Design a protein around this ligand. Structure first.
Ligand SMILES: NCCc1c[nH]c2ccccc12
Length: 305
C-alpha cells in the first residue's frame, strides 16, 4: 500500500471541489475568493474561469481571506460539468444555483428557492449525464457560510435535497429535514441519488426509479461524511472526517472511503500530511488520480495510490 502525493499550489485559498470537461485536460476548482479557476497544466498554471457573483471584481475580491467579503464576492461550494453540452453548473453560498457556458464568465442564475423557502447555503451539485437533470443540496434554511458554529451548536436539521430540470426550468424539492447534507451524487444508471448527512454519519439513498420510488433509506454509515463523487466504475468516494472527540475542535482522523451501490466498503485511505489530522471536503477519482479538496489548505492535493 504505496502513496504518491502531488501538491499544486492554488491561487486564492481552499480549493474545495473539482470537475472536468469533455476535453479532459486539466481541471476546474472553486476557491475561497469566489472564483472558479481552471488549471491548464504545469507550464500554463491557473486562470480565471467563472464567477458566481455578478459583482466579483479584482481589487476588492481577489485573494480575500475576509469572510465579511463573501456576501458580495460569493463562495462557490461545488461545480459539475454537463459533458454533452459543455456547460458547468455552480452552487454558490450567496448566489445559489447557476450555470455557465464553455466560455466561462459571470454565471447565469437558475434558482434561489424551493417551495417558497429561499436557499441559505447550497453545497453539493451533480449532473446526471443521462437525463441532464441536476441534483443539489442546501445545508440549512437558517445558517450560511459564516454560521458553522451555530449549525453545530443547534445541531441544525433543516437541510434539503432538490432537483433542477433544465428542460422544464423547474426546481423540485426531494427531501427536507436533512442533518447537514454536505454531499450528493447520482448513480451511473440514474436510478437513485445519494446524500451524505454530516451530523448523522450516514449515506442516505433516495430512489429516482423502480418500485421504491420517492422513498429513502440508510445505505451505509460513515463518520462525518462530506462530498460524494461517483467514479468511472460507478462506485462512490466520500470524505470521512472522523471527529474522534465528537466535535470539530478535537482530533480528526480523515479518510477517503470508497463504497458501492449496496453500501459495501471497498477501500479506506487515510490522508497523508498535510491533510492528516484535519477535516476535508472531497476526494474525487479521475483518471487513476485522487483529488483532495479541503477548506483550509492552499494547495490542491492529488493522490496516486
Ligand atoms: N469538512 C467535512 C464536511 C463538512 C465540514 N464542514 C461542513 C459544514 C457543513 C456541511 C459539511 C461540512
Amino acid at each position: 500500500p504505496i502513496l504518491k502525493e502531488i501538491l499544486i499550489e492554488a491561487p486564492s485559498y481552499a480549493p474545495n471541489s473539482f470537475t472536468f470537461d469533455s476535453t479532459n485536460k486539466g481541471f476546474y476548482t472553486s476557491v475561497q475568493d469566489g472564483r472558479v479557476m481552471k488549471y491548464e497544466g504545469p507550464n500554463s498554471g491557473f486562470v480565471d474561469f467563472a464567477y458566481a457573483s455578478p459583482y466579483w471584481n479584482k481589487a476588492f475580491c481577489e485573494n480575500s481571506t475576509d469572510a465579511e467579503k463573501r456576501p458580495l464576492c460569493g463562495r462557490t461550494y461545488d461545480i459539475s460539468y454537463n459533458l454533452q453540452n459543455n456547460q458547468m453548473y455552480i452552487v454558490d453560498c450567496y448566489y445559489h444555483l447557476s450555470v455557465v457556458g464553455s466560455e466561462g464568465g459571470h454565471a447565469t442564475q437558475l434558482a434561489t428557492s424551493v417551495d417558497g423557502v429561499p436557499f441559505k447555503w447550497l453545497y453539493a451539485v451533480t449532473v446526471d449525464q443521462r437525463t441532464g437533470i441536476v441534483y443539489f443540496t442546501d445545508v440549512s434554511t437558517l445558517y450560511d457560510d459564516r454560521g458553522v458554529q451555530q449549525i453545530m451548536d443547534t445541531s441544525d436539521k433543516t437541510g434539503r435535497l432538490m432537483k433542477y430540470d433544465p428542460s422544464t426550468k423547474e426546481t423540485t424539492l426531494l427531501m427536507k429535514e436533512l442533518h447537514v447534507p454536505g454531499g450528493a451524487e447520482v448513480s451511473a444508471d440514474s436510478s437513485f441519488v445519494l446524500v451524505a448527512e454530516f451530523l448523522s454519519h450516514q449515506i442516505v439513498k433516495y430512489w429516482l426509479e423502480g418500485p421504491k420510488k420517492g422513498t429513502a433509506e440508510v445505505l451505509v454509515k460513515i463518520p462525518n461524511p462530506g462530498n460524494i463523487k461517483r467514479n468511472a466504475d460507478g462506485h462512490f468516494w466520500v470524505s470521512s472526517s472522523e471527529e474522534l472527540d465528537g466535535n470539530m475542535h478535537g482530533r480528526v482522523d480523515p479518510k477517503g472511503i470508497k463504497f458501492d451501490e449496496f453500501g459495501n466498503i471497498l477501500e479506506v485511505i487515510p490522508l497523508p500530511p498535510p491533510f492528516a489530522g484535519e477535516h476535508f471536503e472531497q476526494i474525487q477519482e479521475h483518471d487513476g488520480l485522487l483529488y483532495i479538496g479541503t477548506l483550509f489548505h492552499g494547495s490542491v492535493g492529488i493522490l496516486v495510490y
